[PDB]
Amino acid sequence: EISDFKEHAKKKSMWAGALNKVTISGLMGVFTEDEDLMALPIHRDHCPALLKIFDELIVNATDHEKVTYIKISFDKGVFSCENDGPGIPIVKHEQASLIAKRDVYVPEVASCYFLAGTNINKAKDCIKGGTNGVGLKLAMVHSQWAILTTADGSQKYVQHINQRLDNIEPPTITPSREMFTRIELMPVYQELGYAQPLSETEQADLSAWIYLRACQCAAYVGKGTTIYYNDKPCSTSSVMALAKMYTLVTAPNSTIYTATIKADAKPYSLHPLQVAAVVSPKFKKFEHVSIINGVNCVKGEHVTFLKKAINEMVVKKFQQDSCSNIFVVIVGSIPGIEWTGQRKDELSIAENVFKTHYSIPSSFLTSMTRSIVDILLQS
Ligand SMILES: Nc1ncnc2c1ncn2[C@@H]1O[C@H](COP(=O)(O)OP(=O)(O)OP(=O)(O)O)[C@@H](O)[C@H]1O
């Protein structure tokens, strides 16, 4: 058989991950207990592709980020993401219109054409997460119904995109003074293994997962942008706040080691990396949370660079594993990375980029090493 994009994306895990519920190691959400935000594990199977619907929209918003807000909503199964800043241009796309037999505007190409977007010829120093021109189409292909709304300050464009991209309805274009981009959709929950409608536990888990993703965004975006989840601001705007949120239950009142890792030469020098770490004997193994180019990256040589520097100092000080008692948060942009798949689970880079260009403050390493060695000595 020869498949098309749409049918292939509905059947193949390569685009967004598994298309039913599986065990997702390290799956976390944020939950509220009287004034406090705590990240907690979600020890139930979930559908990776469903979580990717949400992630693709969220990263598109952080990529655009002037942008003063990103508003994420999740209620009655309906997910939406809206950001301000310039809208998607409301102009006819001449290629797509010529090939098709009708008018096709840019927002339809952006949302309905695979391998299409503004990052196809991305520069190596561009720090947007988006690269493939795929992610928004994956959101549409996994939607029972979806609505794209965008406005450019002179016109507003509304288009319904239904039935997993089978039913693209003609857009409605009106004069408007607004300026934003909004995607609203209902995922195909039943096809992805969920109840219709979501069960109480499915709803609670998904809401917690989205809220945590929003909190991660709050630490990544520029200081002019506010992140909202269900109309309430997400105020975990620093790596320190993230580190607290991830360690509040296990190690309350924790000391937070902080550093800004900076590079000497452009383009690396344009992109300092923010780090916060917590050291506790209660931690069973090394864990990191990395938000790189807006993407929650689970594997990359940036982590290894930090671990080796810590290990270097711990071995020396102990003489006078070294990382199993560490939880670390790393947030920032890295130019020149390559992702290993559309999911962007792992970034790829030469380890020597960090060795040549980046400096980890010695005061941060020294402070961490002292606490690490004390734990080792007390054992
Ligand atoms: N929220 C948004 N605001 C503004 N433009 C957007 C937004 N979402 C998508 N776009 C535009 O639509 C294009 C297509 O988005 P899509 O997610 O499919 O591709 P991408 O982000 O370029 O790459 P990737 O497949 O890696 O996510 C983007 O390149 C961007 O130009």
Numbering used by the authors: 5 to 69, 78 to 332, 345 to 403
Give me lines lifted from the publication on this model.
The African swine fever virus (ASFV) type II topoisomerase (Topo II), pP1192R, is the only known Topo II expressed by mammalian viruses and is essential for ASFV replication in the host cytoplasm. In ASFV, a functional viral Topo II pP1192R has been identified, encoded by a viral gene conserved in ASFV strains, P1192R. pP1192R is detectable at an intermediate to late stage of ASFV infection, mainly within the cytoplasmic virus factory, and has been confirmed to be important for ASFV replication. Topo IIAs exhibit a 2-fold symmetry and comprise two functional domains: an ATPase domain and a DNA binding/cleavage domain. The mechanism of enzymatic action involves the opening and closing of three gate-like dimeric interfaces, which are called the N-, DNA- and C-gate, respectively, upon ATP binding and hydrolysis and DNA cleavage that introduces a double-strand break in the DNA (G-segment) trapped in the DNA-gate for transport of another DNA strand (T-segment).
To provide detailed information of the ATPase domain and support the model building of the full-length pP1192R, the atomic resolution structure of the ATPase domain of pP1192R in complex with the nonhydrolyzable homolog of ATP (AMP-PNP) was determined by X-ray crystallography at 1.8 Å using a truncated pP1192R-ATPase protein expressed as soluble protein in E. coli cells. The electron density map is of good quality, with only a few flexible terminal residues and two regions containing R70-T76 and I334-R343 being disordered. Interestingly, the region R70-T76 was found to exhibit large conformational changes under different redox conditions, as detailed by Chang et al., involving the formation and breakage of the disulfide bond between C72 and C138, which may reflect a redox regulatory mechanism of pP1192R. Our structure shows high overall similarity to both the reduced and oxidized forms, with the RMSD values of 0.18 and 0.102 Å, respectively. The observed flexibility in this region of our structure may reflect an intermediate state that transitions to the reduced or oxidized conformation. The pP1192R-ATPase displayed a conserved heart-shaped dimeric architecture as its homologs with each protomer consisting of two well characterized regions, i.e. the N-terminal GHKL ATP-binding fold and the C-terminal Transducer domain. The bound AMP-PNP in the pP1192R ATPase adopts an identical orientation to that of the other Topo IIAs ATPases, and the secondary structure elements comprising the binding pocket are conserved. The primary interactions were correspondingly mediated by residues on the β4 strand, the α4 helix and the extended loop between the α5 and α6 helices, termed as the ‘ATP-lid’, with the previously defined QTK-loop of the transducer domain forming salt bridges with the γ-phosphate of AMP-PNP.
